[PDB]
Scaffold this active site. Sequence first.
Site, mmCIF file in Angstrom:
data_model
loop_
_atom_site.group_PDB
_atom_site.id
_atom_site.type_symbol
_atom_site.label_atom_id
_atom_site.label_comp_id
_atom_site.label_asym_id
_atom_site.label_seq_id
_atom_site.Cartn_x
_atom_site.Cartn_y
_atom_site.Cartn_z
ATOM 1 N N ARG A 33 39.875 34.273 36.307
ATOM 2 C CA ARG A 33 40.229 33.194 37.228
ATOM 3 C C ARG A 33 39.073 33.008 38.194
ATOM 4 O O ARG A 33 38.757 33.920 38.966
ATOM 5 C CB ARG A 33 41.525 33.511 37.991
ATOM 6 C CG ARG A 33 41.834 32.491 39.085
ATOM 7 C CD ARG A 33 42.990 32.951 39.932
ATOM 8 N NE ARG A 33 44.254 32.855 39.213
ATOM 9 C CZ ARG A 33 45.288 33.661 39.427
ATOM 10 N NH1 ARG A 33 45.199 34.635 40.322
ATOM 11 N NH2 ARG A 33 46.415 33.499 38.743
ATOM 12 N N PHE A 59 36.166 29.419 46.670
ATOM 13 C CA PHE A 59 37.229 30.375 46.961
ATOM 14 C C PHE A 59 36.783 31.773 46.536
ATOM 15 O O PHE A 59 36.307 32.549 47.376
ATOM 16 C CB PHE A 59 38.535 29.935 46.277
ATOM 17 C CG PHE A 59 39.733 30.842 46.547
ATOM 18 C CD1 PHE A 59 39.724 31.769 47.573
ATOM 19 C CD2 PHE A 59 40.877 30.738 45.756
ATOM 20 C CE1 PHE A 59 40.822 32.604 47.796
ATOM 21 C CE2 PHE A 59 41.987 31.566 45.977
ATOM 22 C CZ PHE A 59 41.961 32.492 47.000
ATOM 23 N N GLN A 86 37.740 36.175 40.254
ATOM 24 C CA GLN A 86 38.693 37.269 40.056
ATOM 25 C C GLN A 86 38.532 37.882 38.668
ATOM 26 O O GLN A 86 38.397 37.161 37.671
ATOM 27 C CB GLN A 86 40.135 36.764 40.231
ATOM 28 C CG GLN A 86 41.229 37.842 40.122
ATOM 29 C CD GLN A 86 42.602 37.296 40.478
ATOM 30 O OE1 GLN A 86 42.721 36.193 41.005
ATOM 31 N NE2 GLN A 86 43.647 38.065 40.181
ATOM 32 N N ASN A 88 46.437 41.420 44.117
ATOM 33 C CA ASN A 88 47.708 42.133 44.094
ATOM 34 C C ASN A 88 48.845 41.187 43.744
ATOM 35 O O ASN A 88 48.672 39.966 43.654
ATOM 36 C CB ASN A 88 47.955 42.900 45.402
ATOM 37 C CG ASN A 88 48.134 41.984 46.595
ATOM 38 O OD1 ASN A 88 48.899 41.013 46.539
ATOM 39 N ND2 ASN A 88 47.432 42.283 47.685
ATOM 40 N N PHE A 105 38.572 40.752 43.372
ATOM 41 C CA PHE A 105 37.896 39.466 43.517
ATOM 42 C C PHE A 105 36.702 39.581 44.446
ATOM 43 O O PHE A 105 36.637 40.458 45.314
ATOM 44 C CB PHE A 105 38.829 38.315 43.946
ATOM 45 C CG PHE A 105 39.513 38.517 45.279
ATOM 46 C CD1 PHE A 105 40.631 39.345 45.396
ATOM 47 C CD2 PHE A 105 39.087 37.815 46.403
ATOM 48 C CE1 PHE A 105 41.267 39.509 46.621
ATOM 49 C CE2 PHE A 105 39.728 37.965 47.627
ATOM 50 C CZ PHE A 105 40.834 38.802 47.734
ATOM 51 N N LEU A 116 43.587 35.781 53.950
ATOM 52 C CA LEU A 116 44.013 36.928 53.163
ATOM 53 C C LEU A 116 44.002 38.226 53.960
ATOM 54 O O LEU A 116 44.471 39.248 53.450
ATOM 55 C CB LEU A 116 43.128 37.064 51.919
ATOM 56 C CG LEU A 116 43.126 35.836 50.994
ATOM 57 C CD1 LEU A 116 42.251 36.106 49.777
ATOM 58 C CD2 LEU A 116 44.545 35.464 50.547
HETATM 59 N N1 LIG Z 1 47.789 45.060 39.844
HETATM 60 C C1 LIG Z 1 47.880 43.619 39.772
HETATM 61 C C2 LIG Z 1 47.203 42.878 40.628
HETATM 62 C C3 LIG Z 1 47.294 41.369 40.536
HETATM 63 C C4 LIG Z 1 48.053 40.791 39.621
HETATM 64 C C5 LIG Z 1 48.147 39.272 39.516
HETATM 65 N N2 LIG Z 1 48.260 38.752 40.850
HETATM 66 C C6 LIG Z 1 47.337 37.786 41.355
HETATM 67 O O1 LIG Z 1 46.419 37.355 40.711
HETATM 68 N N3 LIG Z 1 47.608 37.395 42.708
HETATM 69 C C7 LIG Z 1 46.730 36.469 43.371
HETATM 70 C C8 LIG Z 1 45.626 37.330 43.989
HETATM 71 O O2 LIG Z 1 45.608 38.526 44.040
HETATM 72 N N4 LIG Z 1 44.538 36.638 44.536
HETATM 73 C C9 LIG Z 1 43.355 37.234 45.169
HETATM 74 C C10 LIG Z 1 42.357 36.043 45.189
HETATM 75 C C11 LIG Z 1 42.985 35.126 44.148
HETATM 76 N N5 LIG Z 1 44.324 35.297 44.612
HETATM 77 C C12 LIG Z 1 45.070 34.381 45.405
HETATM 78 C C13 LIG Z 1 45.421 34.829 46.591
HETATM 79 C C14 LIG Z 1 46.133 33.904 47.558
HETATM 80 C C15 LIG Z 1 46.370 32.655 47.204
HETATM 81 C C16 LIG Z 1 45.929 32.131 45.838
HETATM 82 C C17 LIG Z 1 45.297 32.951 45.015
HETATM 83 BR BR1 LIG Z 1 44.727 32.365 43.274
HETATM 84 C C18 LIG Z 1 48.808 41.650 38.633
HETATM 85 C C19 LIG Z 1 48.724 42.967 38.694
HETATM 86 NA NA NA Z 2 41.299 27.835 48.443
#
Ligand SMILES: Nc1ccc(CNC(=O)NCC(=O)N2CCCN2c2ccccc2Br)cc1
Ligand code: NA
Length: 164
Positions: free
Chosen positions: A54, A59, A62, A101, A112, A121
């Site tokens: 991703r 931004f 990831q 997370n 990321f 965040l």
């Molecule tokens: N162990 C584990 C860890 C993660 C996951 C899947 N979870 C996930 O990707 N969550 C999103 C996230 O972490 N992030 C960080 C930056 C991208 N993002 C984001 C954050 C705020 C708003 C929009 C976005 Br897009 C499954 C298992």
């Molecule tokens: Na953004």
Amino acid sequence: GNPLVYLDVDANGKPLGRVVLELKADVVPKTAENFRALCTGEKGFGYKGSTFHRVIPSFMCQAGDFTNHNGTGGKSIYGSRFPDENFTLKHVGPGVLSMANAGPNTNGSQFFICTIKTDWLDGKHVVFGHVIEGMDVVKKIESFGSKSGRTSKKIVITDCGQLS
Ligand SMILES: Nc1ccc(CNC(=O)NCC(=O)N2CCCN2c2ccccc2Br)cc1
Ligand code: NA
Ligand code: NA
Ligand code: NA
């Protein structure tokens, strides 16, 4: 002191260069150690051969889901998940390295690298290091992303490890 690690990244099998990261073991030792060992592969698994799944321009980029390769998986060196260590370090600007997370206390292996200040965040994602060198490589990764997060080329961590 603080580990110095690297990721070598390619796009569609063509090398983009190397990202060097400092891991803030002085502030978040458990989170830094997880990432360090996943870079070396010394526990028998880790980031080598996995993807940036991703990538959202203006931004972050990831990566780290080396089990499902789609953002639903990954695992830590301790187990499936580990607690949020602290929120002492903040998302101060481009180059911040932070844990992805699925809510509180769900750190695994996904992470990321920010390409902007993502202070919204702060207190929700554990920051654990930053880019020492290779921000231009991070910008190349970013250039293959989209607002949807889907990449236009397959972005692979071909190699990774520890420098000091
Ligand atoms: N162990 C584990 C860890 C993660 C996951 C899947 N979870 C996930 O990707 N969550 C999103 C996230 O972490 N992030 C960080 C930056 C991208 N993002 C984001 C954050 C705020 C708003 C929009 C976005 Br897009 C499954 C298992
Ligand atoms: Na953004
Ligand atoms: Na320093
Ligand atoms: Na709790």
